[PDB]
Amino acid sequence: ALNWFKNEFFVDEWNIADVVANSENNYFTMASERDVDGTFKLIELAKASKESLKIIPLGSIENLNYAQEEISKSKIEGGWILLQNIQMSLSWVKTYLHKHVEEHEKFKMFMTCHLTGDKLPAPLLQRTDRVVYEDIPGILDTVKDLWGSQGVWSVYCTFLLSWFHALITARTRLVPHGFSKKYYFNDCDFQFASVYLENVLATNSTNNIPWAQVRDHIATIVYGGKIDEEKDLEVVAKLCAHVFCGSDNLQIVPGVRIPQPLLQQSEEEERARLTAILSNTIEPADSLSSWLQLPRESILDYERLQAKEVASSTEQLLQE
Amino acid sequence: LESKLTKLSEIQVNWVEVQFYWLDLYGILGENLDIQNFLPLETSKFKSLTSEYKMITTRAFQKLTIDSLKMIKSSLSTFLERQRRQFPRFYFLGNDDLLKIIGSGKHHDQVSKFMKKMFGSIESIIFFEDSITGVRSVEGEVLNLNEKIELKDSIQAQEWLNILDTEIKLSVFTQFRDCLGQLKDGTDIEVVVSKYIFQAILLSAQVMWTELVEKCLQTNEFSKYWKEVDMKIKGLLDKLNKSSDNVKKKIEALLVEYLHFNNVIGQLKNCSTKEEARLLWAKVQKFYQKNDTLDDLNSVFISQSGYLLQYKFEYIGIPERLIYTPLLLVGFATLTDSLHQKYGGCFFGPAGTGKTETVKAFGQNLGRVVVVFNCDDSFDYQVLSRLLVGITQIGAWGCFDEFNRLDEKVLSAVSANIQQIQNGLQVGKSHITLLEEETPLSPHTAVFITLNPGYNGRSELPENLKKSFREFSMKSPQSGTIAEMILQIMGFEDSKSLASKIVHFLELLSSKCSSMNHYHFGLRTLKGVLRNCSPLVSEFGEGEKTVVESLKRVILPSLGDTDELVFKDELSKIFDSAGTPLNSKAIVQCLKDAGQRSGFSMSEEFLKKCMQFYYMQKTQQALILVGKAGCGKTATWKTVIDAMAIFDGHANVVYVIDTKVLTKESLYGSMLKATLEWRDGLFTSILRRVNDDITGTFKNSRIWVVFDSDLDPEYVEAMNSVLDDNKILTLPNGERLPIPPNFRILFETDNLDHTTPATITRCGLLWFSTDVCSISSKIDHLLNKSYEALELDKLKDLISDSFDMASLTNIFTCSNDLVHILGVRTFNKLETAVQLAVHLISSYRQWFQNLDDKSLKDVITLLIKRSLLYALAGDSTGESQRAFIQTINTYFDSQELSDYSTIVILSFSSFCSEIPSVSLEAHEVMRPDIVIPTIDTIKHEKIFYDLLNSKRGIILCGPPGSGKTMIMNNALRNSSLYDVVGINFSKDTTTEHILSALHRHTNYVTTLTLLPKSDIKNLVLFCDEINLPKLDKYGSQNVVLFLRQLMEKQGFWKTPENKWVTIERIHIVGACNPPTDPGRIPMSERFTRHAAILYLGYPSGKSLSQIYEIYYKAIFKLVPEFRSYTEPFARASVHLYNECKARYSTGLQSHYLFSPRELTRLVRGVYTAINTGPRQTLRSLIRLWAYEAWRIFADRLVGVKEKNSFEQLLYETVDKYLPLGNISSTSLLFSGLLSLDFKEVNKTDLVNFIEERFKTFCDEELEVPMVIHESMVDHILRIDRALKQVQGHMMLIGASRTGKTILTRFVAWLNGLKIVQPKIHRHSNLSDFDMILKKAISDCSLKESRTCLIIDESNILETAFLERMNTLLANADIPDLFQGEEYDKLLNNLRNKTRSLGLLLDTEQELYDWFVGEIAKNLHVVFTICDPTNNKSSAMISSPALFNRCIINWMGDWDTKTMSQVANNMVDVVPMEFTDFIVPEVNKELVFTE
Amino acid sequence: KTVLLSFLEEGFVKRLENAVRFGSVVIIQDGEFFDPIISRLISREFNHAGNRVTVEIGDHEVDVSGD
Ligand SMILES: Nc1ncnc2c1ncn2[C@@H]1O[C@H](COP(=O)(O)OP(=O)(O)OP(=O)(O)O)[C@@H](O)[C@H]1O
Ligand SMILES: Nc1ncnc2c1ncn2[C@@H]1O[C@H](COP(=O)(O)OP(=O)(O)O)[C@@H](O)[C@H]1O
Ligand SMILES: Nc1ncnc2c1ncn2[C@@H]1O[C@H](COP(=O)(O)OP(=O)(O)O)[C@@H](O)[C@H]1O
Ligand SMILES: Nc1ncnc2c1ncn2[C@@H]1O[C@H](COP(=O)(O)OP(=O)(O)O)[C@@H](O)[C@H]1O
Ligand SMILES: [Mg+2]
């Protein structure tokens, strides 16, 4: 019901690439909460646009002087530059950065701050475009994003790994029943799991895929490192056993079935077939419950609380 | 000639240091060729230093040189940087060790001393005829090099160090290859274990194991290999008993490895299918070997989970091998996964779970020594990046233990460097840039972090740093497996059941005990109980008695009262029986002998605690002593060290370091950013002196370091690498100080609320449940100590017989029912009683030779009763004091001690005959030292002087204005034995202020010793408002702990030079308010233990009437016609003060605090108005007193309701006591501007005069169009009255633009003062305020210029400005301003001014007193506060010195009358009446004007 | 004739003194970081001696041009 307004009246949305490619300002500020970062998004975006980032974290006087010198140099000849955790240098931001922004054509500067941190100065913040980086909440949208970011078995295992990452990132945002604490699995875990899958498929040319090894390594080493409690490890192992069971038929979603690749295909047609079988999937309204294999009570309570909060806030908003 | 010997020793130490520095300088530049041409200026400086050294040597054979050497040490810093660039491992050495290692041109023996700091696993080098043939590990194991290294005199250090480093790898690879060939030949390992080194046998055994497991995995059987491994393990177990110590350690570690092998084989055998067997085999580490690698050192690679790592072939010696738990294997797997992509491995979880040891075990399996670093708050960006650039070049694995300890800014700053090293390792870059320098990057390097999340006072890692690390949880280790394999290796007959019983017992002890903070029973205490059961096998044997005895000796001292019973019940019900206890005859005899030597008493509890401490210190290096304040911890460890020194014959040195009195930079050390050099702290200097052994006196003598303060995590936790198994100290500059086995650390505190479980499990814990000493034993020991500090035998016998214990215990029980300020237990009060009684007996002993036995007994009993009263009930109210003296009189034929009984010169008398007549004149009221004596005043004087003559600390406490400084100064003014220095404390006071206030009163003489400047008089250190110094975030006070250290230990530690001083003739007297007063904080009992506490209540109403009628008689000696009116004025003033204190309380406003200070100020104001005035009638005198009461009492009132209430109170008081027109504030106008005398004046004439004066001031100084009004006339009259006084200061509080600074400037111009407004602005520091105050003080004193200082509220940038102003107003000068060279220049200028004026003043004290008098006379300060709600203004108002000196004049907002007057007077000059107006019909209350 | 200063730029006092001597119109940005050296300019206190008017700013006195 909440997404009905967005999907009915509004026909477009902008990601970070769209807002950085359609803004006249040379300065951008991205805010993110604790235990989430968006630096890799900037790295991939700069790689796509064929430009070099100068990552300059703040917090020390030497880094402040280096940032001043690099800002002057990049205003002289060009090039991008990025500032990490600018709230650690509040005095520098208040004086030098404010004076510089207040006072080239291929020069853009990105600043990353924390939403729960100290208050940034209003005159600086209003003079720069603002982006908020959050993980995409939809499951199928997350699968599509992870697939579009990217023998045939490597591609198929990448597809299954993207599905597993989307499932676990969807499950990790349900506090009392999905897990025990607030675990957040960033892109580094996905990259490490993909490297492990490539290494396993490279060292095993017999095509007898050791799915037990992949299951244990993913559920214990890669995605199980941050897991602290025993029951969270058990549920991660259950999810990895459901996804990486290694069978010809694999119904990870009650409406999506992935046939295993055959021994006569190439990577291009395999990627096309997997994209085609991903495109036909229609996400139901109960995809937060049926896809994650959870009882309806917890999902219903969470959705009801979210709906009550958003409706009360917009009712308080509309009256004035 | 003790001073001569000390001077000779100091000169010899300085000469030895200078000789070592010159030897290093000659080694680096003076001897070697082709090295002076690098820096020609430094070469010339070295030549000049050589000439100076040669001249000094010739003069000595037949200071300044050291200073010149230190000056040219800066020019050698970049040379040392290049030298460290030459050999990467020099980054682990300090500057002095680098100088020693370069200067060893031909001796080559200095290398082995620092090689342990360099490599980390080698303690010495075997030398044979100018060649290297062997290398010796830390554990004593010897490795013989493959080829003998030739040595020449011309070659310098780093070339042969590099070839030795390569030769170590070649030798260990050669031994590994030979051992592997021998094992492949088919021989057993029992003959190979006695030939090659341990790393070679471990690696060959692992390679053989993985090869045979692969061969068996090709098939599907495991029984035969399991049986063979079992026979090998049993053979090693049988061989362990018949081998030497080194072979025992080697066989133990091989047993660890083979037990892991058998565990893996057993896991594989019980497996069902082939796929699960392949899974279990892929999960565990495998040690392969390339058969096509031509390179020798890269022929061994380690495979796990499909990834590969390269063996480094570094010598590791004999490490304590970790038991291969499944958690350890999963940790190895995730470390391999992190290291495959050149990331950084990370571990998080609760403390004591095996993270740093896991990293070290992984490094040892990879055959390299993991360098461990203990992160600290002092690690800024430069230090951390220098450590990173030092571990890049070496290639060793850096483990940053406790990574959360870093500041969050540094965590964000080092993220760029960590990403850079990761990218350089990934892309195979050769050179990376850090600190704007390009450095080589060894491809073997890595970084590890082991943080401890979830504890307070720790930062949280930012995401950009956490994304560069791979973290793994380590919440729960496996205690059962560790205990089982360790007990199997030790040779215990029963291993599995015993380990299960130990783990079950530990779990039951954790679950079934009181859940306080310091009960942690994790892995660390299991390792401790196993290590304590290790050496008990020689006396108890392998079995169950050994483990129950070790469990007792490890856990029991840390248990409480009921937890001990629970522990005993559990131990009796889970284990079969308790073995035969230790005889312990010699040690208990030594404890008894030491106690008899020190005068203590052996009770059951004290002896039990001593035995427990000795047994738990026999194997645990660090001990924490906890319990109640004054329980007996210090006595316990002192007597057990004395007994242990007697028993073992080893001399013992103790360093008692107070942790919280020193900052962290003073304790561990600080780096000077202006030169990037390292300055040693205190603990680091002590450890370096112990390690270096210049004189070799610490070879066989133990060292104890006692941290006698609270356990601050930010202080103690920085020694985490010291306390644990690492036993190393990691300095920020890179120095690694090893901890010797005999070096032990003690902790002494009372509360463990703020401590962390990380630093609790590291140290052994000893809890003091109850007091170790009985009460009567405490009297006995105190009496014996006081006697030793001093016929005598008869006096001692009768005094000891006087203390009847049966009455004493009931007296102590009845003492508990009274109310006590600064609540201290009666057990801690006996010091004052015993010391006071002994001092009185020793003082009156000179008259004890001329009286009978009964009179002697009666006098001594009365003195003991007086001492007991003033000790036990000396800090209670008057009624409680009367009740206690009645009780002690009841509980003791003996002479009765009344409420005012005393002894004069030897007859018992009272204070009624000791009250003298006072000839108080008129002019003597202004003198602050004039005190009118009463019974209470003279009694307090006698008891305070009595306590101070007994060499004890005194804490005078009472409500403000009780008279604490009054009684003290009046008692010490008539005595020529002590001097009083005035120190006032604020919310921000440091030890440096106390030391500065004593530098101009005391002398540093080396014999260090802080003797007073005078030689016949002691010095009294008066500290005022001890409550005011605030707590930190961890509930501790710097100043209070400094005072405790100065009282008990009789000294302190000098911060910059790190030498212990000893205080000799300084007594500490403290003044404070009760803790129930707002703004005050409680103080720890560890400070109030050492000092006597006295309650000083307010004088009674009739008493105050008596003193103030004496004052009024003194005043009215001027005017004799009103001599009969002194008593009504005293009664009226006392009633007025009582009514003001009762009605206007603190509940209405913050600054409604009244005191007898107000009455004294009223009397002094009445005196000034009488003296500077004409002949007064009765009505004029009444109006004068009413005006003085208005300007003293009602100035601080804020509300118009309060003003009207005070006016009607004044009317009521005048009508009641003094049978006169309006006496309102607007109707009383007393001023001396209109005449030559302080007479009452009218309104219009005063307004006209002030109009003319304001016009002249505007035309003379600056133009401001301000309109006179009646309220401003009253305000300017009271400001002029306040500034006319001697030592008169103001605090004008009111809204902005009411007119405060312009009014003060106009008053100062009227009185001829000089306005000095500080020009404090933005980006201004404390230094500019120092210069402003110093210039103002100099212009006030030297130039005799009357200076008025206006300090606006916006001119206080920091709280230190407020502290400086508080010091200025409390004393008369600033101790911090005039010190050293500035002090000498000030004294020279003061001497020149005194000679110019013509006074014959020559002594320092007289000149300083004249300076103080001049600055008090000629300086007045007027404050200005706009908003009294702000925190800075609230602290300014609530400050002790500012409130007790300034006359608070509340300007307030403009009332409607002032607004109407100024509006009429400023719009009367414009034509407003040009139109018709009809008068409206409005109410009287609605209209504000006429 | 206008001139732009700011409290966050070094050399503020010298430029302000030169502008006061010349008589130009001065605008200062970033007023939330007010500098108390100009407190005498804010208070508009004047010292008159003949046809000249002097104002103390910081350490040394300067003359107000009148415009
Ligand atoms: N066995 C004993 N026999 C006699 N007197 C004892 C004994 N044990 C302790 N005392 C007395 O107890 C006093 C206080 O003990 P101690 O000096 O050890 O205090 P502490 O532990 O340092 O105190 P705090 O932690 O409060 O600073 C000692 O001065 C000593 O006179
Ligand atoms: N097999 C093992 N695994 C883990 N810890 C062990 C093992 N054997 C002994 N220990 C003990 O556990 C302790 C581990 O300390 P650790 O948790 O690394 O400290 P920190 O938490 O400060 O890094 C060591 O004192 C060590 O003696
Ligand atoms: N003979 C006396 N009897 C009682 N009170 C007196 C006598 N002489 C002076 N006083 C009062 O004692 C006060 C001293 O108080 P003080 O010790 O300065 O307070 P605090 O202890 O808060 O510093 C003086 O203000 C004075 O009014
Ligand atoms: N009676 C008055 N008539 C005219 N102006 C007044 C009067 N009283 C105060 N002022 C104004 O108040 C200002 C002085 O206030 P000042 O003492 O500098 O405030 P602050 O004490 O907050 O520094 C002057 O500029 C003046 O214009
Ligand atoms: Mg640790």
Side-chain angles (χ1 to χ4, degrees), chain A residues 26-52:
Chain A
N26 278 334
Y27 306 80
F28 299 87
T29 298
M30 160 194 306
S32 63
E33 309 84 341
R34 187 74 35 185
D35 189 74
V36 56
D37 199 18
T39 304
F40 75 100
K41 271 299 278 186
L42 270 298
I43 297 298
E44 299 216 70
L45 183 162
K47 189 63 64 67
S49 289
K50 297 184 287 291
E51 204 65 33
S52 64

Side-chain angles (χ1 to χ4, degrees), chain B residues 1264-1269 1272 1294-1303 1305 1352 1424 1426 1454 1458 1462 1466, chain C residues 43:
Chain B
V1264 54
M1266 185 178 288
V1267 174
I1268 314 294
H1269 47 282
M1272 193 274 257
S1296 54
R1297 293 183 77 184
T1298 318
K1300 291 174 279 185
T1301 183
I1302 181 65
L1303 263 68
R1305 176 180 300 105
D1352 202 288
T1424 309
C1426 295
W1454 270 0
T1458 287
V1462 69
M1466 197 156 51
Chain C
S43 75

